[PDB]
Amino acid sequence: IVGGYTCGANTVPYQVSLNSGYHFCGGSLINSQWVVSAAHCYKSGIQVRLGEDNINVVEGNEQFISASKSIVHPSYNSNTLNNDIMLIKLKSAASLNSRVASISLPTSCASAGTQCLISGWGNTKSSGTSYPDVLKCLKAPILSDSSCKSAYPGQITSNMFCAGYLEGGKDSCQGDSGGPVVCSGKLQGIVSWGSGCAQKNKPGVYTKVCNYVSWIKQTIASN
């Protein structure tokens, strides 16, 4: 996250870290046994780490559970990143309390102007790299689809939305991928892509979760 602030330990209880020997992507806990992340974060041998603040220190609230299965969206296109969403089922259910909790899926899509919370352990610099050990947060508004398509001509589909600052300076970045974009207590987006990080007129693009609720619900019900 570039230009954000330190969230504070366990203040984002649905945030998960996907680990394959190291942290490589974020995700969101939607119920005790399922996590949603970005399809581009797919790989085999994933361990989901919940209750984390410092990913390099066991502080006491962590739950490390391996994934039993991953399901990438049937129409995921890795060249365009259209339908960039995946579901991960945990081998056992996590124990939910105040520091580890699930986030609700949305009943309606959010509108441009809505302020959201984006979090993750990704890069904090727009040029160069510096990866934080504790969770960073950023409050950003969803931008109009017109502004979004104008910043990324020929690249935004109906399954994507932009959120951020056209002026630059504040944005999600590499390492934040798969993480949550929560607006009014509902999961509205997943950190997907962008041109660089925090660059002027190149806001972050996010998977529009409201368009996948039926797929999520039907998949969980049958697996």
Known binding residues for Ca(2+) are 52, 54, 57, 62
Q: In what order do the strands lie in the sheet with 160-163?
A: 5-6, 136-141, 115-120, 180-183, 186-193, 204-208, 160-163
* 174 touching Ca ion, by CB under 5 A: no
Catalytic residues, by residue number, are 40, 84, 177
Residue 200, token pair as written in the block: 């002027």
Give least dist CB 162 to Ca ion, A. 32
Distance CA 49, CA 39 (A): 18
Closest CA to 213 of 54, 85, 53: 85
* 32 touching Ca ion, by CB under 5 A: no
Where is the binding site for substrate, in residues? Answer: 171-172, 174-175, 177
Distance CA 5, CA 136 (A): 5
* 211 touching Ca ion, by CB under 5 A: no
* 61 touching Ca ion, by CB under 5 A: no
Give least dist CB 136 to Ca ion, A. 15
Q: Are 50 and 63 in contact (CB under 8 A)?
A: yes
* 54 touching Ca ion, by CB under 5 A: yes
* 114 touching Ca ion, by CB under 5 A: no
Contact residues for Ca ion, defined by CB under 5 A: 52, 54, 57, 59
